[PDB]
Structures are given as C-alpha cells and as structure tokens.
Design a protein around this nucleic acid. Structure first.
Ligand SMILES: Nc1nc2c(ncn2[C@H]2C[C@H](O)[C@@H](COP(=O)(O)OP(=O)(O)OP(=O)(O)O)O2)c(=O)[nH]1
Ligand SMILES: [Ca+2]
Ligand SMILES: [Ca+2]
Ligand SMILES: [Ca+2]
Ligand SMILES: [Ca+2]
Ligand SMILES: [Ca+2]
Ligand SMILES: [Ca+2]
Length: 901
DNA sequence: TCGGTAAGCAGTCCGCG
DNA sequence: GCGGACTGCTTAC
C-alpha cells in the first residue's frame, strides 16, 4: 500500500512523525529535516523557482530548522521578504508525501475516552486535579473494545466490582441497559488503588497510543485532568508519557474576556467531539451536555440516576460505571450518524495538514495552496501584518411585509466560490484597476464597460484572463467534491420521500428491508418492491435513507463551508493571501449579480404578463430571489387545477422551461459586461410554495429582512409527501426561544399558511388557556452568558446589566454558601425565567445552567414565583403579533355584526 | 467562546415638553 | 410608551 502520515511534530531540529508504512504497520521516526526558504534574486541568474508574480527566487537550504527560523528573523531585521513555507512540518509533509494521499482508516487508531472524578467540594478543576480519578472508559477503534478501568478503593468510598450481568439487564430488572451490541466488547479491569490504575492506564496507552483522540469535552476536561493528576501523583516525566514523544506544552487559549489552559500532547491529534460537533453540525443548541445532544441526535433517553453526581459512586457504583461506559458509546453513536471523524480525516489528508488543523480554514487553505504552487516550483509569499479593517458584504432587499400566496425562489449555486472562478480572483491574477461608477450604474447596465482586456468586478478590480489563478484552481477541486456529495444527499432525500409515500399503504406481511444504495435514485424495480413492503421494513428503509442523507449532508455542507471559508479568509488578516481588494471584489460582484438579476427577472415577467413596472421579485438575500407567482397561477385560473400537486408541477415546469433560460440569458449578458473569464452564475429554482389547493391558508409571509415563512411543496427537486414549512429567522428557529414556545409558534405558522385565520384563532385561544401547565424547562428562555464578572457589583447588577446576567446574579445569591450547587460557567448557556413582583429572590428573573434541572434548594420557590404572564407576552404573544400583523391576520376574533344573534 | 458581513430582536438607559 | 444609541446575542446568507 501507499504510505501515509498519522501525526507530525517539530521538536527543536527534528521532525517526529508517526506513519503507516508500505506494509500497513504503524511506525515512528525522527528526521533531521533540512528546510528550504527563498529570497528574490537578480533576473540575470538561472533559477527554476519563481514567486507567484513570476519574479525569480534563489533557494536557501538550511543545516537545520532553527537556522531557518533565525534567517527569517534576520531578513525582517534587514527589511526583506523571506519567502516559502515557514511552518516546517507542512513542508516536511509536502516533501515526504508528494502525491494524493490514499489513507486507510482501519489502520488509524481512533480513541474515544471519558473519565469520572468524584468531588464533594464542587467542580473538579483540571488545573488542580486534587481528586482521585475513579473510572476511565477508553474505546480503541482498532481493537473495537471498551477498556474499563475501575477504582474500587478511594478516600471517598470503597465499592464492589461492577457487574456486567446487571449492566446488561433492562432498567425494569434493576439493570443499567448497557446496549447488548457492546456487552461482548467490554474489557473490565478493577483496581484496589488509584496509583495502580494510572500506571496500568499509561502502560496500556503506550501499547495502544491514540492517533486521533476524541470524546466529549476531552480537550478542556479529561485530558488536562488525567495529565495533571498523574503529574501530581508521580511527577512531570510520568505525565509526559501521554505523548509518544514525551513532549507536552501547556497551551493558553485566549478569548475576548479571559483565557483557559489545555495540554498539547505532541504526536497526538486531539479532536474533541464537542468541538467537531460545534464546527460541523450546523446547529446551535440550547445545551451541549452529552445527555442533551445524544437525545437530540439519537432520540435516546437521558441517563437517569438519583442524588447528585458527587454521591453516585458511593450510592450506586454499578450505575456509575455503566453510565461512564454508555457515555463513551453515545459519542461513537453520534459519530456513526454524523461522520465528523471521517470528514476530518478526508479534509486533513487532502490539505496535507495535522488532522487537528481542520478547525482552521486559514491553515487548511494555506496548505492546499502551498502544495499546489510547489507542484509548479512556485514560491509562496511571506505572511505579513495587517490592521483589521471592516469591508462590505452582501445586499439584502427590504421586503414589503405581507402575506404572499404563491412563491417560487431561485438561488445561485455556490455563489462566492463561483464568483472567484468566474472573475478569476487570486493574489497573482490582479491586473490593475478601473474607474468605478456607482453600483446602481452597473446594475442597470448604464456604466461604461470596465475593460476590453481583463475580467472585472464592480469594485474596480481587474484580473488576468489568460490562465486560472491558484485560488480559482484549488477552489474548483473542492467545489467538485462538494457537488458530488450534494448529489448523494439529494438522491437520499428523494428516496426518503418515496418511502414516506409508500408508508401510506403498508402491506400486511412479514419481509425484510431491501438491500439498496440510498445515494442513487431508486430504480423502477425498487419502487415496485417498496409498494409491497410491510410498515416494519419501510420504516427501517426510511431510517437508512435518512442516515444516508445525513452522511451526504455532513460531506457536502462542510465542503461548502471550506470553499466559502476561502472567500472569507481573503478578508482575515492572518491569511497569507489576505487582500481586501480581492475580498471586496467578491462581495461587490455578488451585490451586482443579485440586483442585476432582480431587474432581469422583473423585466421578463412584466413582458410575459403584459404589464410594466410591476415588482415580481419580492425579496432577495445575497444570492437568492423570491418571485411572486400569483399572476402566473391566475393566468391559468385556480379552478383549472386538479389538486395541489397539479399546480406545483405547472410552476415547476414554468420555472425550468421559461424562467431559468431567461435567468441564464441575463447572467450571460452580465458576464460579457464584466468581461469575465467564464460564465458560472448558475441560478436554479429552489422552492415552490403556496397554500393547499382549496384551503384558506395564506401560503407564506415576510415580516422583514431575514424573517419569513413558506409552505413548501418542492425543494430543489424533492417533491415532499407532505408540505414542509420553510421558516427563516423567526423565533421558531432561534435557540434562545423556549422549546414549548418554538413548538407553539410553529403550529401557529402552520395553521396560518395551510389552514387560515380561523384555524390560527382556535389554536391561539387554547395555547393561552393551557400554557401554565407546561414544564418550567420547556418555557425557559436560553442565552449564552458572557462577562458575568463585569456586571457583578457585590453580587448585584451593575450599570447596563443584561437581563440574562441579572438572572445569574440572582441565582448566585440564592445558592451562596452552598459548595455543591451547580455553578454557572462563564461563556456557557443558561436557562432564564422571569419572577413575579415580591418574590424572595429579590429580583425580576433567575437563570441557571442550561440542559439541567434547577437545584432542589430553590426549585420549588422558582416554580411558585415564575411569571407566566410575562413569559407568555414576551416569548409568544409579541412574536405572534409580529407574524400576524405582517400577514394582515388577527390571532383573536374581532367583534362583528353577527355577535347579536 | 481558538478555529467573512448583514441584520434581526431583547434589553438598558434616557430623552421626549 | 416608543425610539435612538448602545450592548448582547443569534440568525441568514
Ligand atoms: N464565509 C462564509 N460565507 C458564507 C457562509 N454562508 C454563506 N456565505 C456566503 C457565501 C455564499 O456563497 C453566499 C450564499 O450563501 P448560500 O447559503 O446560498 O450558499 P452557496 O451559494 O455558497 O451554496 P449553495 O450551492 O447555495 O448551497 O453567502 C459561511 O458560513 N461563511
Ligand atoms: Ca460522567
Ligand atoms: Ca446559493
Ligand atoms: Ca440550488
Ligand atoms: Ca403497499
Ligand atoms: Ca441562498
Ligand atoms: Ca426598542
């Protein structure tokens, strides 16, 4: 097989590399890598190395990496550019793996672990590590085993061995319900003292050294705790055995309002799953406790136990250990679904970076571009200092707040990356500038044509047309991968709808789910078999289709994020290729493109309808337009349609056969106007929306920019079995909105769009009457909690104290003195409830850590004093008032002349 | 929260005769 | 009470 790296580090003058050799074996080597850097040289000197602007460079070979670093400093002291890859491990990887990396995940040791630490006096601080580690569960992907290290004797209690037999039993049998599929995979090791546990853990780690190390909160808790505990018990040298190279560094992670410490383990790639989830999931969650996320992702029940976690080991060690094991497994289950580890490996090996570098778009693109240029013997420029400067972004049209009955939307494929490719925007393709007219003049095609030679953006920038820049070249490669995965995602989605349709008529039979590839549209044969399947088999197929769709989503959306990140990186001062001329060339071109096509679409539809000056485009944001289709439907007449699906077909055909070619012609003209390299503005129909045929539903409404709701029948070619609400920006979509209120507001919107005013009024009346029975957690608002200290003045709110922070201060006073009460963590999320006048907490609200029950100390008082009226008005009535006034609807029935009989 | 801009709403403070 | 200046937070792209 082809060799591939696992990890790479620079330690002084050596590269330390762990890798898989040509025989599939894991090896380690220390290499005294001699790096090269570059300086500009005279034109009259034979060289094969040229910078990105075509100027010749001489290669300088250094005796070691320190000499190279020292040369860079001296070049700065002289005032001359020091060119080349200054991150020597990336240059090392580039030299050692000069080919597309083919990796084999089965050879990569991925470890998932979780520790338990009993603590009577509050949260066990990893920096102090003053309490025994009393359980470790460590799953190894090569062995496919859960290694359980269980401490039986501690200063906080001596316990009996954990029983695998009780663990496996149902909770209704007094068991822990450890999933039967992992029972045979558990290797249980009890210990009579912590020193032996830890020594054996280190020996095990030496034998089975993680390459990828993951788990939940491992980077901020488990790793620093284990490292510091071993340090405290045995000394530094022993703790450093967590690194295969015996090198570690305390790394200070700084933010706007403070800092925290993590431990860097040289020769390991830590991918904390909480951080993977935050980066790759495209959710914003009210809580990031593993219980919360596992319930969200997997629909598994919360892990239940009585009493505080600090007493769980002593009271129920059996459950304590089972729950530690289940926690490790839940992360594996989330990864089986989301495939974030697979994604990280794909991206990391593609860029030729340390896998953990996938968190940084700047590092990722720096490596991709370097490798690409090096192929051509080109030499990358030195990174420079730039002051942070704001620059302009997208255009968003101000909509007229209203109901909109029939709507068709259109959206440009991969806009910013397509602009980069079309215009040919790259550091080395800058050709010069032209005299800019106001943007409106380009939008309306009255400005002078910018150039007859170069490719232009309306910000005044011109670009070479003779050859693709490295940025367009490399962005195109990742765009093509994204396109492939999006194809699979959409096929799985369409296949899911086929199964949902079939589920309306399940067969009374015993059978099996079909063995199919859900990434490809079902054949006629498969469709016929599906129509004969039982509900059991269909539901299993639906689950599998949806899992295929999720895998496709992960693969596609994060490649989209990577390419969009390149467009953004051009506007970040830490990027080697930072250039506001290029960043603004992209965004300004986007503004023009949107407004240009709005004009073209309006002109086309005014022509087909025989009107003038009518606004068909009701809204647009960045690269999408929303077109009112009422007049189109009305030209046929609603009475002429057999059913909803009939007019959906008609609009689908109209969009594809009439509007899209008109849109294409419009953009080809704009491409010629800007003299661009290649026409890549591809704007396709996204949504078809409207009320159910014959209903009183309103179909859709806008309240303002970035705030709208649509009843969608077809999205990007997926024809839904049931209409789907597309809701953007409204409170139903915000993590700050109480769970039960999101649900209620969604049902209000559903009724407005699908059923009409009377239906909405019926539901509102009932919600208002019954909502006081809702569980307090479900009606609590949520907020991130920053700068608690700034606003704390002797335990009371200082000037301008935010409402959620006031709530936290209230909570702090109420739990004061109590060492065991859950502390609100700076920067994390809190639930927030308002309090009625005259409550014993002495303020108007209280907040506590999100994803948790409020402590039993104050719960009953919070429940007694909760201000339901304020809750309802703020979270429900106010947003609903916004929706209905925009939609010209009443959520409460107005008096009429009939109220007299 | 270590890892592009536009723009909405909640809330504070305070003016507004 | 509501709007502007401002902070804080959270979306849509
Ligand atoms: N830097 C950055 N830019 C973004 C992000 N999301 C959207 N944008 C910018 C770049 C996009 O090309 C543009 C339009 O966004 P869309 O959501 O329509 O995505 P895009 O057109 O890239 O892909 P698509 O093919 O429509 O899925 O807005 C983001 O997360 N980061
Ligand atoms: Ca735990
Ligand atoms: Ca788009
Ligand atoms: Ca599309
Ligand atoms: Ca059937
Ligand atoms: Ca869009
Ligand atoms: Ca206001």
């Amino acid at each position: 097989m082809k060799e591939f790296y696992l990890t790479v580090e620079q330690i002084g003058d050596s590269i330390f590399e762990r890798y898989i050799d040509s025989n599939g074996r894991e090896r380690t080597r220390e290499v005294e890598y001699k790096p090269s850097l570059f300086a500009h040289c005279p034109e009259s000197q034979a060289t094969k190395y040229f910078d990105i602007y075509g100027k010749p460079c001489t290669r300088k070979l250094f005796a070691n990496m320190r000499d190279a670093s020292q040369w860079i400093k001296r070049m700065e002291d002289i005032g001359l550019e020091a060119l080349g890859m200054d991150d020597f491990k990336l240059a090392y990887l580039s030299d050692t793996y000069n080919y597309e990396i083919k990796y084999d995940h089965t050879k990569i040791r991925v470890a998932n672990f979780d520790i338990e630490v009993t603590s009577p006096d509050g949260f066990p601080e990893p920096s102090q590590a003053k309490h025994p580690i009393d359980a470790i569960t460590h799953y190894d992907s090569i062995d496919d085993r859960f290694y359980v290290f269980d401490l039986l004797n501690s200063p906080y209690g001596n316990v009996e061995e954990w029983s695998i037999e009780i663990a496996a039993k149902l909770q209704e049998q007094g068991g822990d319900e450890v999933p039967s599929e992992i029972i045979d995979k558990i290797i249980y090791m009890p210990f009579d003292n912590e020193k032996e546990l830890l020594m054996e853990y280190l020996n095990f780690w030496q034998q089975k050294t993680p390459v990828i190390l993951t788990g939940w909160n491992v980077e901020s808790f488990a790793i620093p705790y284990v490292y510091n505990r071993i340090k405290n018990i045995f000394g530094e040298s022993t703790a450093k055995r967590l690194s295969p190279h015996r090198k570690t560094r305390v790394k200070v992670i700084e933010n706007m309002y403070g800092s925290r410490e993590i431990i860097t383990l040289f020769g390991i790639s830590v991918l904390d799953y909480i951080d993977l989830y935050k980066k790759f999931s495209f959710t914003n969650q009210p809580s990031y406790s593993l219980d919360y996320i596992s319930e969200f992702e997997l629909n598994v029940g919360k892990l239940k136990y009585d009493g505080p976690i600090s007493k769980l080991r002593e009271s129920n060690h059996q459950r304590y250990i089972s729950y530690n094991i289940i926690a490790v497994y839940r992360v594996l289950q989330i990864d089986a679904k989301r495939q974030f580890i697979n994604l990280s490996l794909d991206m990391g090996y593609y860029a030729k970076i340390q896998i953990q570098s996938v968190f940084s778009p700047i590092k990722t693109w720096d490596a991709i571009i370097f490798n690409s240029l090096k192929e051509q013997n080109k030499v990358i420029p030195q990174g420079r200092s730039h002051p942070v400067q704001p620059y302009p972004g997208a255009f968003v049209k101000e909509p007229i707040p209203n109901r909109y009955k029939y709507v068709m939307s259109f959206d440009l494929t991969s806009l910013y990356p397509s602009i980069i490719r079309q215009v040919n925007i790259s550091p080395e393709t800058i050709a010069g500038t032209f005299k800019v007219a106001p943007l409106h003049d380009y939008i309306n095609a009255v400005a002078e044509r910018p150039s007859d030679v170069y490719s232009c953006s309306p910000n005044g920038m011109m670009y070479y047309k003779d050859r693709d820049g490295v940025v367009p070249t490399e962005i195109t490669k990742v765009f093509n991968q994204r396109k492939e995965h999006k194809g699979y995602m959409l096929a799985a989605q369409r296949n899911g709808e086929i199964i949902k349709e079939a589920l309306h008529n399940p067969n009374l039979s015993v059978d099996e789910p079909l063995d199919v590839d859900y990434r490809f549209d079902f054949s006629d044969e498969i469709k016929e078999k599906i129509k004969k399947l039982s509900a059991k088999s269909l539901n299993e197929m639906l689950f599998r289709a949806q899992r295929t769709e999720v895998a496709g989503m992960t693969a596609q959306i994060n490649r989209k994020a990577l390419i969009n990140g390149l467009a953004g990186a051009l506007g970040n001062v830490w990027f080697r290729y930072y250039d506001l001329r290029n960043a603004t060339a992209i965004t300004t071109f986007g503004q023009m493109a949107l407004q240009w096509i709005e004009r073209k679409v309006n002109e086309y539809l005014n022509e087909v309808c025989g009107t003038e000056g009518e606004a068909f485009v009701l809204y647009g944001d960045t690269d999408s337009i929303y077109v009112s289709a009422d007049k189109i439907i009305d030209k046929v007449g609603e009475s002429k349609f057999r059913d909803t699906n009939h007019w959906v077909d008609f609009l689908d055909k109209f969009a594809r056969e009439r509007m899209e070619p008109a849109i294409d012609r419009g953009f080809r003209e704009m491409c010629e106007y800007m003299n661009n390299k290649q026409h890549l503005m591809f704007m396709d129909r996204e949504a078809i929306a409207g009320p159910p045929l014959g209903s009183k539903g309103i179909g859709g409404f806008w309240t303002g920019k970035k705030r709208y709701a649509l009843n969608v029948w077809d999205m990007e070619g997926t024809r839904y079995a049931e209409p789907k609400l597309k809701i953007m920006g409204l409170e139903t979509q915000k993590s700050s909105t109480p769970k039960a209120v999101q649900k209620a507001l969604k049902e209000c919107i559903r009724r407005m769009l699908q059923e009409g005013e009377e239906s909405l009024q019926e539901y509102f009346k009932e919600f208002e009457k019954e909502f006081r029975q809702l569980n307090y957690i479900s009606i609590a608002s949520v907020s991130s909690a920053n700068n608690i200290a700034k606003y704390d003045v002797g335990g009371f709110p200082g000037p301008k104290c935010p409402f959620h922070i006031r709530g936290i201060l209230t909570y702090n006073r109420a739990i004061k003195g109590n060492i065991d009460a859950p502390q609100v963590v700076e920067g994390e999320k809190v639930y927030v409830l308002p309090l009625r006048e005259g409550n014993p907490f002495g303020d108007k609200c209280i907040a506590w850590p999100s994803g948790t029950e409020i402590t039993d100390l104050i719960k009953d008082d919070v429940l007694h004093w909760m201000d339901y009226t304020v809750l309802l008005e703020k979270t429900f009535i106010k947003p609903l008032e916004g929706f209905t006034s925009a939609a010209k609807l009443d959520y409460e029935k107005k008096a009429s002349l009939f109220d007299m009989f």
